[PDB]
Design an enzyme around this catalytic site. Structure first.
Site, PDB file in Angstrom:
ATOM      1  N   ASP A 142       0.819  -1.205   0.000  1.00  0.00           N
ATOM      2  CA  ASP A 142       0.000   0.000   0.000  1.00  0.00           C
ATOM      3  C   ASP A 142       0.865   1.273   0.000  1.00  0.00           C
ATOM      4  O   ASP A 142       1.885   1.324  -0.693  1.00  0.00           O
ATOM      5  CB  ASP A 142      -0.928  -0.049   1.229  1.00  0.00           C
ATOM      6  N   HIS A 160      -3.831   5.926   4.462  1.00  0.00           N
ATOM      7  CA  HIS A 160      -4.438   4.695   3.952  1.00  0.00           C
ATOM      8  C   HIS A 160      -3.832   3.441   4.632  1.00  0.00           C
ATOM      9  O   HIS A 160      -4.538   2.759   5.381  1.00  0.00           O
ATOM     10  CB  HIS A 160      -4.329   4.636   2.413  1.00  0.00           C
ATOM     11  N   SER A 196     -10.916  -1.553   0.631  1.00  0.00           N
ATOM     12  CA  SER A 196      -9.604  -1.809   1.237  1.00  0.00           C
ATOM     13  C   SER A 196      -9.831  -2.298   2.647  1.00  0.00           C
ATOM     14  O   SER A 196      -9.227  -3.286   3.039  1.00  0.00           O
ATOM     15  CB  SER A 196      -8.761  -0.538   1.287  1.00  0.00           C
TER      16      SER A 196
END
Lengths: 492, 92
Positions: free
Chosen positions: A23, A63, A223
């Site tokens: 990621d 994230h 996600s």
């Protein structure tokens, strides 16, 4: 006090493995993941768009930190006690490249060979368009024994159009909110259909906030749903380290929450294809036979159109079936392609197209073979049976070249019949039947507690029958004297 | 000759960078040589090419930053299975 998501994945009776996360950058010093995460020297990201990039305001690690927090996080994590390895494939602006992802996936394979054997999950909370290479790279890693968990996509579309989501030898995860509904993200939301294996919590998901060492934040997206599944797989693999991807998927499917999702949100044409499963941890450490339904992509309204449903190499195709919303279908056959059984369904001439539906099972030491019989045109009908001792009928198939129509398969007088016969230790199979004189929409028969559905079938009598498909352990016969025929199997 | 593959979503394409995938069973040496052959084949034509990575372990192949004008030349290369143009992936 427990977050709804962790509360949801926990069953009423409620557990080494390395989790690679490909990621953005991560806040490795966050209270949630400190000690649990090891940031690799790996990083392959494209330059941020300058015109919209202010480094001083940019929280580059938002994230990834949240996701790592979902998988392993101490206070609000799924599998608390999971070794995690961070890889930077996405920049500050949450953008990466197929080429960057390939190098990363190569890096994991490099680590796998150098480090001594042990279970390893790979979390891909990213999506791009369909990439034949990215899918090939995943297929190679899966064959290498890695458990890959990808996000389905936030584009309110068919998951089969995006990679890594489309690669079939990877667990694809859709997103569902608190009220077991598919997550809306802006005017879009969770992806669906054939390529999605299951759904998991994906709205209002509390995890680590890279803002400060101890702060948390609720985030929404596929996600997050992919992170829950990664954690569940890591939880599972911690107890059974020898588990294959096929094995883990089959268990994930089995232990999930059946028929919760209000499918209405998905386009009608996708409802039947999109699985109604919500991720849940198995209630204990642990013989049982597992079977999954493998719908294939629509044949197309073409005249010579054909649909192909196939199983993982690790799996046995116990039964094959077909479906058509119009009702126009030429049947289905269990054929061999590239040295393995495949479910191929042909489209009827005026037909809008057909669907081929396979039933893929995990059977150890199984000698499965197809017994074919041509139509002889008799008052009784076309028949075929397992002659070999210890060979059990796991499912029927029947196709007809025409346009207008005890351990044995019975089909139409004009149709060529195809029986599946397996030899497996302590495998026993019974046939359950259920009929209705004038159907309303469908007739259903289901295997009892302990018995696994291997073969779903419609009794060859009614002309107007749209098709027959297995749903979990329920033989479903869509019919716009319809009798549903279920082949129930088990091992002791 | 091999096949060319681009991302179907046109705004997600990243032309000028190609993943040259070689046939299954191609040793690092053959991958290495082919990547150097393309550089020389292109060089003679007055083109500059940058081999960014040579895949060794997952896929037989390489990564080349080059002009799309060289794709037909690259497709005719020995051991090439297919060439996929690079494209974007995003946080989900």
């Amino acid at each position: 006090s427990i977050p709804w998501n962790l509360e949801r994945i926990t069953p009423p009776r409620y557990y080494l493995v390395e989790v690679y996360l490909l990621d953005t950058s991560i806040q490795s010093d966050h209270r949630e993941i400190e000690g649990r995460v090891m940031v690799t020297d790996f990083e392959n990201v494209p330059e941020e768009d300058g015109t919209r990039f202010h480094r001083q305001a940019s929280k580059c690690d938002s994230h990834g930190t949240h996701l790592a927090g979902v998988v392993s996080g101490r206070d609000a994590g799924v599998a608390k006690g999971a070794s995690m390895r961070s890889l930077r494939v996405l920049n500050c602006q949450g953008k990466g490249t197929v080429s960057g992802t390939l190098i990363g996936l190569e890096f994991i394979r490099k680590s796998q060979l150098v480090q001594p054997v042990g279970p390893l999950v790979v979390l891909l909370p990213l999506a791009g368009g369909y990439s034949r290479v990215l899918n090939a790279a995943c297929q190679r890693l899966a064959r290498a024994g890695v458990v890959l968990v990808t996000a389905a996509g936030n584009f309110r579309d068919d998951a089969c159009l995006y990679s890594p989501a489309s690669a079939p030898e990877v667990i694809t995860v859709g997103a569902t909110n608190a009220q077991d509904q598919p997550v809306t993200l802006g005017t879009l939301g969770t992806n669906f259909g054939r390529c999605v294996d299951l759904f998991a919590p994906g709205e209002d998901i509390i995890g680590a906030s890279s803002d400060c060492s101890t702060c948390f934040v609720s985030q929404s997206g596929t996600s997050q749903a992919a992170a829950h599944v990664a954690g569940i797989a890591a939880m599972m693999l911690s107890a059974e380290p020898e588990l294959t991807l096929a094995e883990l998927r089959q268990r994930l499917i089995h232990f999930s929450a059946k028929d919760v999702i209000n499918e209405a949100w998905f386009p009608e044409d996708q409802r039947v294809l999109t699985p109604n499963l919500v991720a849940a941890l198995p209630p204990s450490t642990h013989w049982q036979l597992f079977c999954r339904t493998v719908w294939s992509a629509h044949s197309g309204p073409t005249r010579m159109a054909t649909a192909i449903a196939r199983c993982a190499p690790d799996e046995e195709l116990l039964s094959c079936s077909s479906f058509s919303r119009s009702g126009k279908r030429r049947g289905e056959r269990m054929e061999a392609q590239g040295g393995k059984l495949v479910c191929r369904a042909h489209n009827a001439f005026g037909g809008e197209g057909v669907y081929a539906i396979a039933r893929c099972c995990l059977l150890p030491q199984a000698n499965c073979s197809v017994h074919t019989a041509p139509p002889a045109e008799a008052s009784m009908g076309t028949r075929v049976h397992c002659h070999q001792q210890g060979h059990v009928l796991t499912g029927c198939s029947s196709h007809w070249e025409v346009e207008d129509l005890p351990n044995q398969c019975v089909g139409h007088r004009e149709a060529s019949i195809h029986a599946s016969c397996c030899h497996a230790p302590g495998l026993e199979c019974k046939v359950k039947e259920h009929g209705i004189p004038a159907p309303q929409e469908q007739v259903t028969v289901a295997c009892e507690e302990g018995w696994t559905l291997t073969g779903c079938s419609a009794l060859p009598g009614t002309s107007h029958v749209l098709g027959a498909y297995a749903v979990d352990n329920t033989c479903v016969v869509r019919s716009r004297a319809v009798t549903a025929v279920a082949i129930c199997c088990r091992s002791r | 000759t091999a096949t060319f593959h681009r991302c179907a979503k046109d705004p997600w394409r990243l032309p000028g960078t190609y993943v040259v995938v070689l046939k299954e069973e191609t040793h690092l040496s053959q991958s290495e040589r082919t990547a150097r052959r393309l550089q020389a084949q292109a060089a003679r034509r007055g083109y500059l090419t940058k081999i960014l990575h040579v895949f060794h372990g997952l896929l037989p192949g390489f990564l080349v930053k080059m002009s799309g004008d060289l794709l037909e030349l690259a497709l005719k290369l020995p051991h090439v299975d297919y060439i996929e143009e690079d494209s974007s992936v995003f946080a989900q």
